[PDB]
């Protein structure tokens, strides 16, 4: 498998790891997930409510559930901001 | 770094590896990128213009250039379809 395939499988497997058989994430799943995968990101926001800011606009419908596609829009937003950073600076 | 951070980086770097210094993808770059990164996916499209058709969907500004956000939209579409199939037949 190519690198991208591995990347994709990883994202897919990470979602299911923290969402469980319920097949979706609650705020708390999301919060744990961010804590295990993006700890420096959270600590650089001096806000005990970052997961709440983030949960808010993932949950367009207010059902407390975040599915895979919404999960992917979170990863998309971060990776995009990292890339912008990267382009402006690191090369 | 985390599994997610690793996966994200490979997505970032894959873009840049095929976008080169110009920082975007032409339909040629896109075609090469999917040939190397998802060959089994192309090898299953009966359509020979399939790359061309993906390019048309991606190229919102119709300037022949595909940037990182568009790129991520591609990976999105692919990863979400995989996950859909995954849930139905595999989980």
């Amino acid at each position: 498998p190519s690198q991208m395939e591995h990347a994709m499988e990883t994202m897919m497997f990470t979602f299911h790891k923290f969402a469980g058989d319920k097949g979706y994430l609650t705020k708390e799943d999301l919060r744990v997930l961010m804590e295990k995968e993006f700890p420096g990101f959270l600590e650089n926001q001096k806000d005990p409510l970052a997961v709440d800011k983030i949960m808010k606009d993932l949950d367009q419908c207010r059902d407390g559930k975040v599915g895979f596609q919404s999960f992917f829009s979170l990863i998309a937003g971060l990776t995009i901001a990292c890339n912008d950073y990267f382009v402006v600076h690191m090369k | 770094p985390s599994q997610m951070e690793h996966a994200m980086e490979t997505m970032m770097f894959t873009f840049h590896k095929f976008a080169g210094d110009k920082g975007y993808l032409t339909k040629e770059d896109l075609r090469v990128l999917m040939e190397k990164e998802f060959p089994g996916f192309l090898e299953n499209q009966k359509d020979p213009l399939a790359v061309d058709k993906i390019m048309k969907d991606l190229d919102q500004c119709r300037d022949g250039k595909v940037g990182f956000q568009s790129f991520f939209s591609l990976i999105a579409g692919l990863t979400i379809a995989c996950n859909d199939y995954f849930v139905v037949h595999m989980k």
């Binding site: 420096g40 990101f41 926001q45 971060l78 990292c82 | 770094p1």
Partner: peptide
């Protein structure tokens, strides 16, 4: 490792 670096210089 470069993604991890950037993530810590980044905010909502």
């Amino acid at each position: 490792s470069t993604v991890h670096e950037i993530l810590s210089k980044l905010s909502l």
